[PDB]
């Protein structure tokens, strides 16, 4: 007989939606979470992880801010009478932002305290299969469980270049900047860099986007590559094929940053107020202590079964921390939920993490589920492919004529027999909802018939999946 | 032997889409189109039908100046040193959407002329089945055709009361209104209706909704009562149960109606500076002389069957013209495209008018697709059908503060064996947006447990389809 | 025998051009011109009238640094590296226009000079039919002539309101003003008060035009309507129907103008930096002192016959103080010149007046030639009028996204027989050099045939008149 | 009996404008396309033809880029307090002149499908008179017509030399290059040549053209040096009389290219990033096997009657491919146009090939309609032409000090009788905008008289045509 039935480690979106769940299910439960400050500038936030406190969340908000900036010069082509010669408090906007996330925070404690889950504010590292460490601000206690689930996430990584941890920032240090970003290097094109850099414009600042090789790798680079060209329209420089190699500060207070071209070899230098490191993400299976536990990794990943186990039978993870599969929320909190639910409910349904749907949230959006183009042809073959693709025209951009340039949407699907839909994609505005019913229809079986046989909604954009014509081929 | 394989009778959705995929059949076609003018005001238009000109089009673009707007007060809540105090200029406004409904109607003779439909613009009417007359202002024409489609469309209607025509003004006149509407009698509780008093509202006009019986008929009435508290919200008043009795014009150029309480009889009065008949649109089937061909007709418009076909072989009906279907623009556009296709291009395909998804584009819009609550009840049984629902709160909407107490959504479904979705609805921002892709899943088959183990995008409005766990029945379990 | 062949009264279009052309062909001749000073500003220019000083010169300089600012704009879409966040320094910009004025200036008077043009800088008044008083800064001084060319032109008027001769100014005193516009009323929506108010938008002042009834009274007026929503799509508000009723100065040195619905009676008011008053200009018949020749007027103009000549048999008159006749500086020139040489060279040609091509040099231009659309209407009737017209994308604005929604052109035509081409109209970049050629083709008679085989040049925005399909009928 | 009333074969300018035309008077048509990558390279592109993707679009836009990049030194003179310091992002460049290149592309794949065209993404080559084998990635196909028409145009040739294919490039590939130019060598002087090398120079990179024999052979060889003056003033070297020997890739990546002086016999070097081979365009008659149709060609081209007719009746031919008829866009156009009404539509219309505008896209900018000087005097004696001409000073150019040197414009025309135009030549901004017009002009039989007494607009440089005095003869008089 242990302290608890489960002991959670980590408190984010697998972490907390699986100890919920569980005490729901009469286990008796416990969950760590320990939120280390940010290195230099010491940034510290409340329970719930990532996406609350350093993530979707706050990107989201400022995205809107940026969206609302827009909004008002377009106001004015519609005859409004608003002066559109405007600003924004970059400490104000911050504070509106901070106090809805510190609110969320504290009703998420106490609802931690109304479900009888049992919050531990301690970094647990593992002593036995059964046995956890936890180091409180106060002291270490030492607990026991009979199951334990990993739920740790990771945190931004740094380059390994002079200058980076003491001059440069991270995602985790921008949504609460005490200063204003001012002329920003942002580092890495992966969609956290690339929605960083698209806020920060549209808030008046000036972003580079450094690129090392490719525009979001892992996306279809076709979309990928008109996301950045929307972005170069936008007025964002991007310096492509460069890594950076130093960060200085000048007697000015800015930051010099050396840089290299990666192909020719061309080095170069300018300055900014402020370099933001984007280049990915580590997840934290050091302090865990896993060889204590006997658990089995795979660089900062932990690999699992189609069952979340690791090779240690009573141990579980589950979220960013697990190997190869989608670092997002409500992947997270679906999986630790369906885990709780094995483990205390007496459920066999597993994880399903086929065709998940994303929205990168730049100036414009991009949404997709499916595969992309390249990897349907690697995987079926050119000949059994058909692309069917568009550029459009949504009915608000004509009046402020907003740019269409990069208005453009497509369908890859199998070419003969039942024409099933592989993967949707789409740029344009409010991407993420015209995505998402779109992404039920692909678990539903959606063929090219059904899809092209949907009545539109009209006057929207999401209708100009309905009525896709043209195929590459 | 004829003129023409095909006369297209009126040039909007239905009647462009069929006659430009009759001619890519192998046909040949003339297409008649011609606009008769508001009585009083004697507004006009270009081509393409009521969607471009006097619809979807100017009544999106209106929606869109109010949501415009609304943002630039909750970009002051972000941050922004915005001068909040606004006010839109009316006759700017009026202009920039006519500037867009020109270039689409110049956009449309140029695909009609390169397309070689034959455009003839006049008015036509029946001689016999085979014959029709055209009215063109340079003189009329006697025309032949093997087949016609007939797809005339319809106009506002105007209540049989003293004034209603030399005083009040319909959707017809209002996009294009010579000047502000100010204080605004909006009769009807319809989508278009509700569309107009909620943009009149948010562009600082003062609209009254009055209803005679109940509001969004033929919608869910839960959704259609929240759409109208979200309105009363929005400082929009509804006079419940009340019919206009009569306008007439003041000293003082106001708008004098006097109207009444349908329940208890009594009556009264208020002044207004417009007044806008938003109650129904009827079928153009008048100045056709359907019986010179032998058409049968149902009350203003024409019954048709599976085929679009009427009791006369060789002519066919589609668009909002025809009796009992949804009357919008992809279905008249998809229904005229495939009526052409089984004329000419030896095609078997009828039109699906079942699941046709629909947004009403109020301040707080609303979009469905299959059955409400009570269909699927009377279709089913009550025992028989499972209600998912919840409130949801939209990311944007914490900073400014924004009302959540309409943010609603529901799935109806069935209770047992594969538990098939019937019906979607929602109440929230960019609602077109959020159920386009669901009515291509429901068309899928879309089940609750294929609904509900959907990923969800975070952070979006749309993802609280894929989490909907409490039941109106037995909410968690 | 008199002190001279010809005196001509004004040295400015005409006047100059008429001296020039009289002398080369053996006359001996005078020519007066005096610059009366603003009044308030006190506001004065050397020879050479309206256009070189106050008019077309400065106008196009003023047009061309506002489209310099919105080229630095585009350059950028384009992939420049430029800073596009600009100003324009006025006192720079007004140095540049007034050294090139003030150095013309000098190359006329020393011109004058070497052709033997008597040049006298005095106001000339009719004594006699064959007497004119000259009033020189120094002294007076009575000269004689066989005949008199007047060519007095015109001067801007001020509405009879108060405050509007010590608070307001016109075009005389904007070229050259001191102190920056700021924001400025510009009352008068003919071209002149559209052209300012255009390039005051483009150099980040805030103009707002108030119009009395119509915009561009004489030019068709689907086009001025156009031109006019192109303006609002700028940014710049419109007050229609709108009169003022007076200009008073605040203690905040702003001007404080109140004004009038001019259809329900509403009154209103608003604060401005400057008020531009461009509601006309006023033929300057009154100093010429006519009634002493016996000359005939009609309200600040002369009626001539086919030949210039009043109805004095010695006295002509040329330019925009003739009745009727297009106000433009080529017109004045070529009138000018023609009547020097049925003067003096022996010449019968009378100047043509018919189907002058104009250009308006709004933000976006507007050139026409031949009849407006409703003029042709009114005089062949609507069932012998065909109107070709289209809505026209130049390539260069796809990239920038620069506004295509005014981008339109008609052609105004006999709708039968050998239809004839009667009108020609566009708006969009350059239009004035696209339109010239066409002028010359008006001329040469023509048709809608000939129009429409005429080969286009591509890629260009004038080849667009050469593929009209679409009929209005 | 055919398959098909007609087969288009290649879909450019004057083969899409023929086969949408005739597929408009009634013809059943097919219409081939295919786009042979760029050897070394392997550069490729959608449908469309030579303008849209490789030619005058991309050819504009990369002018216009230079032309923003003046504007932005001018802007400074006008008192902006622009930094015109100042350097261009090819990469970015290069990617929205694709956007503008792809969106192009899709807008002509919608109106090839709406319109009836079949359109075939294969090699075709003939079989014989009535039969075509279209080469497909999918498989060929065989496929019979009644009537064929050639529309295939050319590509760029290379010179026949070590190291041309290898290590050179095309106009197919500069647009799309993958890395910046740099130092540059442009062997040709012909307006292709002329235009790469100004606006390289307009975006910083270093141009050298390479001068054969004569600049802008075809043109007014006046208004030819005067451009090859204008572009000596901005800094770009010619090496007059000058073939290349080889190009070389040395151990640094740098080309270097020998040459020889033509008529010294003198042999150089120089090193080079770039080596753009712009010394014509040959038509592409190899791939069609014409033999197997009995057609008759004349090197690289096609000869046809004033009908487009070849010695074959039922094969035509329209385009740049055939035999001595002006290179342009709209001119392939309407020929093909033109072409489709006498087959399909009873007309009986030919081609007007004579005086068709064009203009030279160099940095001070050449346009010109009808007769060069040369040609005038050629055709009706010295003594029987006058040209007016004279200098001018665009307003523009005064504040930025700009040179108006080149800015040069003239008029050749009948010298006696009624003074006909025969050719007018423009060097100067906006020299195509300028032409246009006066084009017309010509077409309705302008007059030296008509010409200058028309009035002139005010300030422009257009109104110069209008206030020509002076002649080369006599002067003034
Ligand atoms: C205010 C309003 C808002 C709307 N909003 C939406 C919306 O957001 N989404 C949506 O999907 N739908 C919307 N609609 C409905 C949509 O506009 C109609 O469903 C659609 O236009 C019907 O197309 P149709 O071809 O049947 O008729 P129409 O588009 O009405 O075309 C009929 C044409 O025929 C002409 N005609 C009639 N009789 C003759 C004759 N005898 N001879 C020659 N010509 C004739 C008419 O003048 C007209 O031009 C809206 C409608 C209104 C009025
Ligand atoms: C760099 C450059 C700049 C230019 N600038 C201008 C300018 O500014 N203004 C202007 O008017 N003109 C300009 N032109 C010329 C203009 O592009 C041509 O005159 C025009 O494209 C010719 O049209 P076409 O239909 O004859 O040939 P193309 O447009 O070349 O079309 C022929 C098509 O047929 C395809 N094809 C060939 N053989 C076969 C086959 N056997 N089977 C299937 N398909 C085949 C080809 O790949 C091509 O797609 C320019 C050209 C170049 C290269």
Same mark, same amino acid.
């Given at each position: 007989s242990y302290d608890y039935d489960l002991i959670v480690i980590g408190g984010g979106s697998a972490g907390l939606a699986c100890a919920k769940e569980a005490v729901l299910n009469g286990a008796r439960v416990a969950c760590l979470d320990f939120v280390k400050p940010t290195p230099t500038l010491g940034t510290k936030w409340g329970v $719930? &992880?990532?996406?609350?406190?350093? &993530?979707c969340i706050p990107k989201k908000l400022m995205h809107q801010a940026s969206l609302l900036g827009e909004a008002v010069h377009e106001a004015a082509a519609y005859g409004?009478?608003? /002066? /559109?010669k405007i600003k924004p408090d970059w400490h104000k906007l911050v504070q509106s932002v901070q106090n809805h996330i510190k609110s969320v925070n504290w009703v998420t404690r106490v609802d931690l305290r109304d479900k009888k889950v049992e919050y531990i504010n301690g970094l647990g590292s593992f002593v036995d299969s059964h046995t956890l460490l936890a180091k409180l601000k106060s002291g270490e206690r030492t607990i026991t469980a009979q199951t334990f689930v990993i739920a740790v996430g990771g945190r931004p990584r740094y380059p390994d270049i002079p200058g980076a941890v003491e001059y440069g920032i991270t995602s985790d240090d921008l949504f609460s900047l005490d200063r204003e970003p001012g002329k920003t290097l942002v580092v890495g094109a992966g969609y956290i860099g690339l929605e960083c850099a698209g806020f920060l414009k549209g808030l008046g600042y000036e972003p580079t986007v450094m690129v090392r090789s490719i525009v979001l790798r892992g996306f279809d680079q076709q979309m990928a590559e008109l996301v950045a060209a929307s972005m170069e329209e936008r007025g964002i420089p991007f310096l492509r094929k460069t890594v950076p190699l130093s960060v200085e500060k000048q007697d000015d207070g800015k930051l010099l940053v050396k840089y290299k071209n990666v192909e020719t070899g061309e080095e170069s230098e300018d300055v900014y107020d402020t370099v933001l490191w984007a280049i990915g993400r580590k997840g934290l299976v050091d302090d865990l202590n896993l060889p204590n536990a006997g658990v089995t990794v795979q660089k900062d990943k932990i690999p699992v079964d189609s069952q979340e186990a690791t090779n240690v039978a009573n141990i579980y993870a589950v979220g /960013?921390?697990?190997? $190869?599969?989608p670092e997002l929320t409500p992947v997270a909190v679906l999986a630790g939920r369906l885990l709780a639910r094995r483990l205390y409910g007496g459920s066999t349904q597993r994880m399903d993490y086929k065709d998940v749907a994303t929205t990168v949230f730049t100036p414009l959006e991009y949404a997709c589920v499916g595969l992309s183009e390249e990897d349907a042809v690697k995987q079926f073959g050119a000949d059994e492919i058909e692309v069917f693709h568009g550029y459009y025209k949504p009915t608000e951009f004509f009046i402020p004529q907003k740019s269409v340039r990069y208005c453009y949407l497509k369908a890859v699907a199998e070419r003969h027999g039942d024409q099933r839909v592989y993967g949707l994609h789409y740029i344009g505005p409010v991407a993420g909802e015209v995505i998402q019913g779109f992404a039920a229809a692909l678990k539903s079986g959606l063929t090219i018939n059904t899809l092209i046989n949907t009545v539109g909604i009209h006057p !929207? !954009?999401?209708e100009e999946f309905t009525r896709l014509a043209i195929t590459k081929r």
């Open positions: $719930g &992880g990532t996406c609350v406190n350093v &993530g409004w009478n608003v /002066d /559109d /960013d921390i697990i190997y $190869g599969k !929207t !954009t999401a």
